[PDB]
Design a protein around this nucleic acid. Sequence first.
DNA 1: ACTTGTCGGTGGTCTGCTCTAACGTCACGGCCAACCGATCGGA
Lengths: 330, 317, 73
Amino acid sequence: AVSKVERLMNLVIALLSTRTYLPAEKIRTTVAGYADSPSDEAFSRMFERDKNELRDLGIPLETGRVSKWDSTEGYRINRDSYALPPIGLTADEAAAVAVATQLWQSPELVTATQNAVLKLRAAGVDVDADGVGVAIASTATLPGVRGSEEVLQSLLSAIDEGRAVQFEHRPSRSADYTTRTVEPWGVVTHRGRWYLVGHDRDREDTRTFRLSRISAAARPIGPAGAVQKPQDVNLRDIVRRAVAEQPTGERARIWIAGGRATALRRQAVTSTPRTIGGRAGEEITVDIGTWDRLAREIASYGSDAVALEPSSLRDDVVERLRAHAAGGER
Amino acid sequence: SQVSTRLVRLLNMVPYFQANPKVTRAEAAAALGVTGKQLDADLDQLWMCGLPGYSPGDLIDFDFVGDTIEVTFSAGVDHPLRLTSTEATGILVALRALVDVPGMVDPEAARSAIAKIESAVGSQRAVVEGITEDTSAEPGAAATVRTAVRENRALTLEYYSASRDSLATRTVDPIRVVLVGDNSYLEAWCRSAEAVRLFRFDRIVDAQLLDDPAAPPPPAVAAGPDTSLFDADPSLPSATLLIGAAAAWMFDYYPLRDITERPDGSCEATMTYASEDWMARFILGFGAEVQVLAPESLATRVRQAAEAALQAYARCV
Amino acid sequence: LTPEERLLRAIFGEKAREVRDTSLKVPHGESGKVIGIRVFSREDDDELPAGVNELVRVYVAQKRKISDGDKLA
DNA sequence: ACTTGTCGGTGGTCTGCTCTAACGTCACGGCCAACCGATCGGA
């Protein structure tokens, strides 16, 4: 009566400590736990199941002939591939790992992170989180990390397996869901926001999809290894280009009263004091960027911010203010 | 499964015990995150398994000195098991997500960790990658905040209050750093108002270090990690506003409540506001896209502000 | 291995490796000064006989003076 | 929840057996090449 864990430990120790390939019969006779098999077929099935389980854990078993003068095949575990190279971690790196190990919430991601941290600590370095004294408050309200957790896990699994992804994506809640089937290339984060990068098989273009919009139905399809993304493609550059398209728009002169509009004050490039209509302030020449965003920013401050140029922006602000002052009828 | 994880832990225990010559029971339990009985059972199971042939000088042997653990024969177990693809990918993703968060971790340390892990596992450019090779956007305030947190020293912060649209300089003692959503907030005790407030890194222009190592009151009274006294309270007024179909920008960046769908756009929602002026600015920003319904006083104030802005624009040139 | 040998190896810690010592030693009643070593390896494109991987020859030189028992004629 | 004895399938490798339909038909190769004595079987 030998437990399965003890049997697997004996098997892996025997494979690691033996410098020559071992056939099945020698393992049956020598390693404990394999001597209670009622029949040879039962032993073969048990050994195949145990070998499959060990191979699933990432242990690089190698199969080859026992000798150049013999035909029977044997088993051996390479010590070089089984052993990770040594790494030296400083206090800052240990603190970084300790802070990063307390982010995920899904059981699978938590288990994987715990196993990785355990292996890293067993490598020789020490990781401590109590010294830093930094915790996480929000655990179920994050729309980027907590909300996009299962989707990110599915995308990472598909990328590892090299398979295409089929999912439903909508540009906005007002719009309708659209089924999209693309070939994933990688995951790039920008300002703490995930952006899936891949090539669409329905439009034949490189698009970036925000993971918050994508639902949890990230079904992976296609044979493994069928995705071969070009190496010269820089995902970060594509994400940066997709984040912003207009470099600086145009130059607009805006007058703002002093002591307020600090958010707009920080965005000012050049400043010039000027008093108009008995109110002091400074005239600033700033960029345009998103026209709607600038119009909203100007209209939010009301009389605090007065637009001067261009005339189109002033007309738009005046129209919006008149619509607001109409009384809500329209 | 559970058995696979137990096997991995039992196989990796030996290198961990070899790394620390005299690791005690408490340190091992904390490192492995298991109870005392479970650790004892795992140690017993690992004790009686080793080299084939099964000789007492061949299998794994320990040396118990009181309540200490030491390895005398590793039986070929010299290095820990390698890292699988899933766990390495998760660690890299977590590190690259936390490197961009200001103040939670030093970017240099995160980059060094990423480089060392990639070198150890042999990853290539086909993995998750960041956006900026070198940020260089930190004004040095985050480093000062981290130093103040570590050394428990007085810190001066010039925080911009968005609700009141003003710059306030306060002297606070850092307590802890927490992450809420995608915006990390610094928790500290301010003697100016005698209350706990959360400050965001992007709203701090600069930080000044002072040599006043004074223990904050909350550690001596109450040091709850959350302390969300005003994050969500019934006393906060709520504004009911009509949102158009075109103005879909606010549906994601703000917590809209009581959302009702109407093809004609006759159904509205309700959102809380910290200050009346902030809500007025938020309403005026969208223009005609957002229509005010309730309360009547807020609508009257918005109309008066719009009329004043129109008069100011007419007077100005 | 005999139980006594296993016990001795366990006590002294010398691991029992499946290796047999076949070191070349100077034969009985011979000595001198090494003057030349020639090493042949298959990987260096050498016409070695099949099944042979390494072959090293060591030359030992000795000066013999006249002594009792040597034959003169 | 995890695991195992029992059941059945693929493909590869090593090993052995049976078959092939113009007509074919009794081997070179030869050492030995000494010398004396004793014994059994044909002429």
